[PDB]
Amino acid sequence: MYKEPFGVKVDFETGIIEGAKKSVRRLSDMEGYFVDERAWKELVEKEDPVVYEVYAVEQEEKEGDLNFATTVLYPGKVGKEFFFTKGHFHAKLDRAEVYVALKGKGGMLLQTPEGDAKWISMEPGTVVYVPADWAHRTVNIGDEPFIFLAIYPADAGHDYGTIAEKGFSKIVIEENGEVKVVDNPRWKK
Amino acid sequence: MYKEPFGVKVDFETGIIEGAKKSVRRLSDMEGYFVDERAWKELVEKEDPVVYEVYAVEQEEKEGDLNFATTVLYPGKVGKEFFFTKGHFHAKLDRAEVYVALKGKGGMLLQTPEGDAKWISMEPGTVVYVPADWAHRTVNIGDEPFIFLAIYPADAGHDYGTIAEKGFSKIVIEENGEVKVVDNPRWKK
Ligand SMILES: [Mn+2]
Ligand SMILES: [Mn+2]
């Protein structure tokens, strides 16, 4: 009749949830995502660094139920562009999400279906409300891993497809040790 | 047109979310909740301590949306019984909840509508999954404030009344400076 309640441990310093489902994304998994494709290729052949890892505790896709996951987003740049998660829209556009920043320095880039953009800086303790209808990506703007916990409806779904093709209308770069949020040159949509 | 995304800061050491709606619950707000009623009256009339504070960031009661709140559960006892939150079932039964422990030592007592209870220990970094259909209450079993963040569907609602009259089937006590989960001596059914 009833699902079993349970506890798991999250290590706030490493992001690891022991016995969660671990996904690893290396740079080679992100062709077409970064603006500087020649820088992408070089770094892929040279080293192919891990860009991010995810530790996810997911339920069966059910309305009213919740999933949670940590992400460890590693520091680095592709050309001038900081490492980031691929980003997605939810499959059901009526699903919100909550992020809680745990370690390091980063931010969230969000985008409406039109291309209207929003940046929210994230340091430890920051809680971000991700509303329905917004595509979302996190960005590591520091020198150490950026670690966060996300809590999201079990039936939210993921649409990675649109972002893979279009990308975000903004990019986050470093020029001169200054972090800048600027127009995506490759934005024609 | 769109709901605005936003970030708020949570201070992990205090539980404070500046810009949240703050709620304070004192012992006098919890008449009939504790087993030792004489100890309850004496403490109300001698001190009326703060039992817990909540900082809540809530949305409209809409499908797919999410609320979040921190709670600061203060240390203490009423007779042998540790300080706890009032507890509730959700008013919509099939709505789950995720709790993240941040500071101190505590735990969650959960119970089905059939009266079967479960206890999950919570130390900093513990994430607790509260499934649909379970009433839930947090308990501070240490000498420091127990601080946690909860994320819950915006339309889960609350049913406080049921617990107000019944209580939980188990209580959490100190006997020999040792934490025990024992039967609620008032439990008939
Ligand atoms: Mn998401
Ligand atoms: Mn609840």
From Swiss-Prot, chains A, B:
Q: Which EC class heads this enzyme's classification?
A: isomerase
Q: How does activity depend on temperature?
A: Optimum temperature is 90-96 degrees Celsius. Highly thermostable.
Annotated GO biological processes are: gluconeogenesis; glycolytic process
| Binding residues annotated for Fe cation, in chain numbering | H88, H90, E97, H136
| Enzyme Commission number(s) | 5.3.1.9
According to the UniProt record, activity depends on pH as follows: Optimum pH is 7.0.
Which cofactors does it use?
A: Fe cation
For this UniProt record, give its keywords in alphabetical order, as a comma-separated list.
Answer: Cytoplasm, Gluconeogenesis, Glycolysis, Iron, Isomerase, Metal-binding
Gene3D superfamilies in the record: Jelly Rolls (2.60.120.10)
Describe how the cofactor binds.
Binds 1 Fe cation per subunit.
Keyword Transmembrane helix appears in the UniProt entry: no
State the oligomer form and interacting partners: Homodimer.
Q: What is this protein called?
A: Glucose-6-phosphate isomerase
Gene behind this protein:
pgiA
